[PDB]
Tab-separated table of C-alpha atoms in Angstrom:
chain	number	residue	atom	x	y	z
A	1	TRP	CA	95.749	49.395	-92.231
A	2	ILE	CA	99.245	48.090	-91.445
A	3	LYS	CA	100.900	51.163	-92.962
A	4	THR	CA	99.078	54.120	-91.409
A	5	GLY	CA	96.681	52.574	-88.880
A	6	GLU	CA	97.647	50.284	-86.039
A	7	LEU	CA	97.493	46.486	-85.908
A	8	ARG	CA	100.157	43.828	-85.477
A	9	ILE	CA	100.219	40.482	-87.268
A	10	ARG	CA	102.442	37.693	-85.947
A	11	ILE	CA	102.835	35.355	-88.919
A	12	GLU	CA	104.281	32.080	-87.651
A	13	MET	CA	106.394	29.798	-89.832
A	14	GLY	CA	109.243	28.445	-87.689
A	15	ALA	CA	112.106	28.899	-90.147
A	16	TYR	CA	112.775	31.506	-92.812
A	17	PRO	CA	115.771	32.861	-94.722
A	18	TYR	CA	116.633	36.472	-94.025
A	19	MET	CA	118.106	39.259	-96.135
A	20	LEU	CA	119.639	42.411	-94.682
A	21	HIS	CA	119.773	46.114	-95.497
A	22	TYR	CA	122.110	48.451	-93.631
A	23	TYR	CA	120.916	52.042	-93.384
A	24	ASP	CA	122.734	55.095	-92.162
A	25	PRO	CA	121.293	56.122	-88.776
A	26	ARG	CA	121.760	59.868	-89.343
A	27	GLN	CA	119.200	60.029	-92.173
A	28	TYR	CA	115.543	59.239	-92.717
A	29	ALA	CA	114.535	55.685	-93.560
A	30	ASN	CA	111.353	53.791	-94.326
A	31	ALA	CA	110.652	50.083	-94.639
A	32	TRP	CA	107.440	50.130	-96.667
A	33	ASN	CA	108.967	49.630	-100.116
A	34	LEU	CA	110.699	46.506	-98.778
A	35	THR	CA	107.918	45.023	-96.663
A	36	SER	CA	105.210	45.675	-99.251
A	37	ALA	CA	107.458	44.038	-101.842
A	38	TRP	CA	107.721	41.045	-99.528
A	39	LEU	CA	103.980	40.896	-98.824
A	40	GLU	CA	102.929	41.151	-102.481
A	41	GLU	CA	105.159	38.288	-103.586
A	42	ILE	CA	103.711	35.746	-101.154
A	43	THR	CA	102.338	32.959	-103.446
A	44	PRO	CA	100.445	29.816	-102.311
A	45	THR	CA	103.571	27.827	-103.246
A	46	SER	CA	106.447	30.181	-102.381
A	47	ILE	CA	107.687	33.046	-100.239
A	48	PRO	CA	110.790	35.160	-100.895
A	49	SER	CA	113.381	35.824	-98.205
B	1	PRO	CA	92.558	62.523	-103.509
B	2	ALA	CA	93.278	58.849	-104.114
B	3	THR	CA	97.013	58.246	-104.538
B	4	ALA	CA	96.549	54.541	-105.439
B	5	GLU	CA	96.159	52.982	-101.937
B	6	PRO	CA	98.831	50.386	-101.087
B	7	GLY	CA	96.652	47.280	-101.135
B	8	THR	CA	97.011	46.230	-104.769
B	9	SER	CA	99.769	45.710	-107.346
B	10	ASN	CA	99.663	42.936	-109.954
B	11	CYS	CA	102.492	40.990	-111.574
B	12	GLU	CA	100.907	37.504	-112.142
B	13	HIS	CA	103.141	35.634	-109.731
B	14	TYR	CA	101.163	32.423	-109.191
B	15	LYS	CA	100.344	30.090	-112.055
B	16	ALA	CA	97.631	27.475	-111.766
B	17	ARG	CA	98.940	24.050	-110.855
B	18	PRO	CA	96.293	21.984	-112.696
B	19	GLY	CA	95.964	24.901	-115.110
B	20	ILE	CA	92.889	27.056	-115.672
B	21	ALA	CA	93.181	26.744	-119.451
B	22	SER	CA	93.289	22.950	-119.115
B	23	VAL	CA	90.465	22.474	-116.601
B	24	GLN	CA	88.110	24.956	-118.254
B	25	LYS	CA	88.371	23.366	-121.709
B	26	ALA	CA	87.078	20.094	-120.252
B	27	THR	CA	84.362	21.804	-118.234
B	28	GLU	CA	83.166	23.458	-121.484
B	29	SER	CA	82.240	20.008	-122.809
B	30	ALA	CA	80.968	18.684	-119.506
B	31	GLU	CA	78.584	21.659	-119.648
B	32	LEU	CA	77.058	20.418	-122.928
B	33	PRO	CA	73.488	19.077	-122.695
B	34	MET	CA	72.335	15.624	-123.716
B	35	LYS	CA	71.788	15.015	-127.426
B	36	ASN	CA	68.158	14.986	-128.507
B	37	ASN	CA	66.419	11.772	-129.576
B	38	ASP	CA	63.564	12.725	-131.858
B	39	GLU	CA	62.742	9.748	-134.067
B	40	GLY	CA	59.508	7.897	-133.406
B	41	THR	CA	57.616	11.098	-132.507
B	42	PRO	CA	55.110	12.896	-134.761
B	43	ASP	CA	55.531	16.251	-136.459
B	44	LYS	CA	52.954	19.036	-136.883
B	45	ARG	CA	51.160	17.222	-139.703
B	46	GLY	CA	51.052	13.860	-137.972
B	47	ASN	CA	53.778	11.818	-139.604
B	48	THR	CA	56.204	9.972	-137.366
B	49	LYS	CA	59.632	11.358	-138.193
B	50	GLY	CA	62.722	9.208	-138.579
B	51	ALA	CA	63.919	6.570	-140.998
B	52	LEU	CA	62.197	3.373	-142.128
B	53	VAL	CA	64.180	0.500	-140.635
B	54	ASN	CA	63.948	-2.569	-138.438
B	55	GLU	CA	64.275	-1.310	-134.876
B	56	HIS	CA	66.915	-3.832	-133.825
B	57	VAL	CA	68.947	-3.215	-136.979
B	58	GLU	CA	68.777	0.513	-136.110
B	59	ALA	CA	69.859	-0.151	-132.521
B	60	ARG	CA	72.856	-2.009	-133.915
B	61	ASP	CA	73.575	0.853	-136.332
B	62	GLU	CA	73.807	3.365	-133.498
B	63	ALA	CA	76.260	1.064	-131.692
B	64	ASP	CA	78.372	1.193	-134.851
B	65	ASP	CA	78.033	4.989	-135.070
B	66	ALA	CA	78.932	5.602	-131.434
B	67	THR	CA	81.885	3.209	-131.655
B	68	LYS	CA	83.228	5.235	-134.590
B	69	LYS	CA	82.526	8.463	-132.683
B	70	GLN	CA	84.484	7.048	-129.729
B	71	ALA	CA	87.356	6.135	-132.053
B	72	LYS	CA	87.425	9.671	-133.433
B	73	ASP	CA	87.194	11.344	-130.011
B	74	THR	CA	90.098	9.250	-128.687
B	75	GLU	CA	92.146	10.590	-131.662
B	76	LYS	CA	92.919	7.105	-133.019
B	77	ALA	CA	91.920	4.601	-135.726
B	78	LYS	CA	90.322	1.757	-133.749
B	79	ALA	CA	88.189	2.387	-130.684
B	80	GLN	CA	89.185	0.945	-127.326
B	81	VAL	CA	85.952	1.436	-125.368
B	82	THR	CA	83.754	-0.246	-127.959
B	83	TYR	CA	79.970	-0.169	-127.863
B	84	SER	CA	79.379	-2.942	-130.412
B	85	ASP	CA	80.550	-6.561	-130.700
B	86	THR	CA	80.810	-6.898	-126.933
B	87	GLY	CA	80.444	-10.144	-125.021
B	88	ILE	CA	76.717	-9.795	-124.361
B	89	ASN	CA	74.140	-11.258	-126.705
B	90	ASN	CA	72.004	-8.121	-126.928
B	91	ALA	CA	69.650	-9.472	-129.567
B	92	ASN	CA	66.347	-8.105	-128.217
B	93	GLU	CA	67.601	-4.514	-128.078
B	94	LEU	CA	65.029	-2.155	-129.592
B	95	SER	CA	65.352	1.526	-130.434
B	96	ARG	CA	62.888	4.121	-131.649
B	97	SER	CA	62.535	4.585	-135.394
B	98	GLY	CA	60.055	5.810	-137.960
B	99	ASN	CA	58.872	2.308	-138.848
B	100	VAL	CA	55.974	2.174	-136.377
B	101	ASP	CA	53.504	4.877	-135.464
B	102	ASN	CA	52.105	5.924	-132.100
B	103	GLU	CA	49.134	3.599	-132.572
B	104	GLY	CA	51.001	0.360	-133.173
B	105	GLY	CA	50.711	0.065	-136.930
B	106	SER	CA	53.242	0.311	-139.721
B	107	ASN	CA	54.514	3.407	-141.487
B	108	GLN	CA	55.095	2.015	-144.967
B	109	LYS	CA	52.563	4.706	-145.931
B	110	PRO	CA	52.423	8.067	-144.106
B	111	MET	CA	49.536	8.860	-141.768
B	112	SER	CA	48.788	12.175	-143.474
B	113	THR	CA	47.900	10.249	-146.621
B	114	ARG	CA	46.289	7.276	-144.850
B	115	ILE	CA	43.721	9.726	-143.462
B	116	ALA	CA	43.494	11.395	-146.879
B	117	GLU	CA	42.653	8.074	-148.536
B	118	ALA	CA	40.155	7.187	-145.797
B	119	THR	CA	38.290	10.457	-146.319
B	120	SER	CA	38.701	10.541	-150.111
B	121	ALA	CA	37.033	7.139	-150.344
B	122	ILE	CA	33.787	9.053	-149.671
B	123	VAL	CA	32.826	11.984	-151.873
B	124	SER	CA	29.523	13.177	-153.288
B	125	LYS	CA	29.228	15.214	-156.474
B	126	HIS	CA	26.424	17.234	-157.996
B	127	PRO	CA	23.958	15.652	-160.426
B	128	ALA	CA	24.341	16.514	-164.093
């Protein structure tokens, strides 16, 4: 539902490390292969950046 | 037209912190029912099954047997939680055994032949 539907989820944690990816603005881009890879790897004892 | 909807993908990221393989192997032996206690009770013929023994001597023998079982289950040579030779004078402790019947008599002789003798004491044969 997050991908093709519409709903927003504000997950609150206070502090988090961030990792960056610089894309070229003249071409197509998509964030799903990054954000799904972040959402799958959330563990009850760990999150990735 | 399912193109493997984006909800699921497995990699086994989380491992169990007490451990499923460690908790389940103890629950397998917590699941086990209580051991049967059969001696003192009659069979289909009528004889009280079990061994012929003084009841208190038998109740001391099972304290010995369960102490040795404790010593084997704790993977050592001498038991630590001992069930015999404790501080308490448990000298009137009785257990069930095959020495007495359900009536209150002895079982030096089986019941299935006590009744056979009591009926075989009366016969009547034909005249010659």
